[PDB]
Structures are given as C-alpha cells and as structure tokens.
C-alpha cells in the first residue's frame, strides 16, 4: 500500500503540469501537504553546503515555506554575508525580507544581535564558528531543510497510469 500524502503529492504535481494553479494551491491548503519539487535532494544538500545561496534562495522561493527554517537559513546567510563584508546587501536582506521581519517581530533580541554583528567593523569568526563550525551549521540546516523537500519524476501520475494500463493489457485483472 501507499501513503495518502504521496498520492496527493502526485495529484498536486499533475495539477502543476496541467497549469491548474488555483486547484493546486487550494489542495495544498486543504490537505496541508505541499509538493516541493527539486531535481535532486543530494544536489539540494550540495547546493546548501557548497555556499551557493542564490540558488538555494531560488528554491526556497519556489517551495512552501515554514517561518522557522526560514529565519534560521536567512540568519546564517546574513552571517555569511557579513563575513564577506557585504554590509549593504546583508542589511537590506535583514530589513526587507519577510522571515527577517517575522524574526524582528517575534524576537527583538535575536534581530538586535544580528544587527549588532553587522554593525561591527570586522568579522569576529573565532567565537561564533568556535562554538559550532560553519560546516556543521550548513550541515544541520541542509539536513533539516532537505528532509522537508521531496523528489518526484515529471508526469509521474501519467506514467503510473500507463503502467496500470500495461498491467491490465498484458497480465490481466482478477476474475471476480
């Protein structure tokens, strides 16, 4: 047998391919499970670990988003930006992005710590990456976020139905 969530994911994929956006969104809302399509989960983890956050942010924009994983990921990307001394970009991301606004609202202290870190004239990596390494943070973020995402072949439902027709045609159905 197969889990309902998987079948609903197949349906949602079909809806996406058939350009039925409204029914797709309404479905995802009602059943509270969302399709999160990626070419490869390993490739996704690779993208997160390597440090290519433009792509990762693209994928993030594509999928259904939890606020917590968002504020975590965006926080880490903020620290990565302030490390590379892209102060303007980091401040703009911290100010003008939705998960960062949510973080600012819910926890003023955390946002204050991030802004304080950005305001510093130099990047003090010893303590922040001393407590937990960059590689480890990237690793846990990649793991938790990737476990949320799924991988499914294009027109999976149709192919499956084709297999069903092949079954009926060449093997046959049960007599009663």
């Amino acid at each position: 047998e197969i889990e309902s969530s998987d079948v609903i994911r197949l349906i949602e994929q079909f809806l996406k391919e058939s350009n039925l956006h409204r029914t797709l969104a309404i479905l995802q809302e009602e059943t509270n499970v969302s399709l999160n399509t990626v070419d490869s989960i390993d490739g996704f983890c690779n993208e997160i670990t390597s440090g290519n956050w433009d792509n990762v942010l693209k994928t993030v924009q594509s999928l259904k988003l939890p606020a917590k994983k968002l504020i975590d990921l965006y926080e880490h990307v903020i620290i990565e930006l302030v490390e590379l001394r892209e102060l303007a970009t980091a401040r703009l991301v911290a100010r003008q992005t939705d998960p960062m606004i949510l973080l600012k609202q819910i926890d003023p202290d955390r946002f204050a710590r991030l802004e304080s870190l950005i305001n510093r004239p130099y990047f003090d990596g010893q303590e922040v990456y001393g407590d937990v390494s960059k590689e480890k943070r990237r690793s846990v973020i990649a793991q938790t976020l990737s476990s949320e995402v799924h991988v499914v072949a294009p027109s999976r439902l149709l192919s499956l139905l084709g297999q069903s027709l092949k079954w009926q045609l060449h093997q046959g159905l049960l007599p009663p």
Partner: peptide, 18 residues
C-alpha cells in the same frame, strides 16, 4: 538598483528583490 559584487551576491539580490 542592484549592487553587483560577487556573482552569487548580484544573483541573490536579483532573486530577493524581484
């Protein structure tokens, strides 16, 4: 309206601000 330093920076800026 897009400050371009690193390629990943200008691209992430492109994505987040559009």
């Amino acid at each position: 309206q897009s400050h371009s330093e690193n390629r990943m920076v200008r691209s992430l800026h492109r994505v987040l601000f559009k």
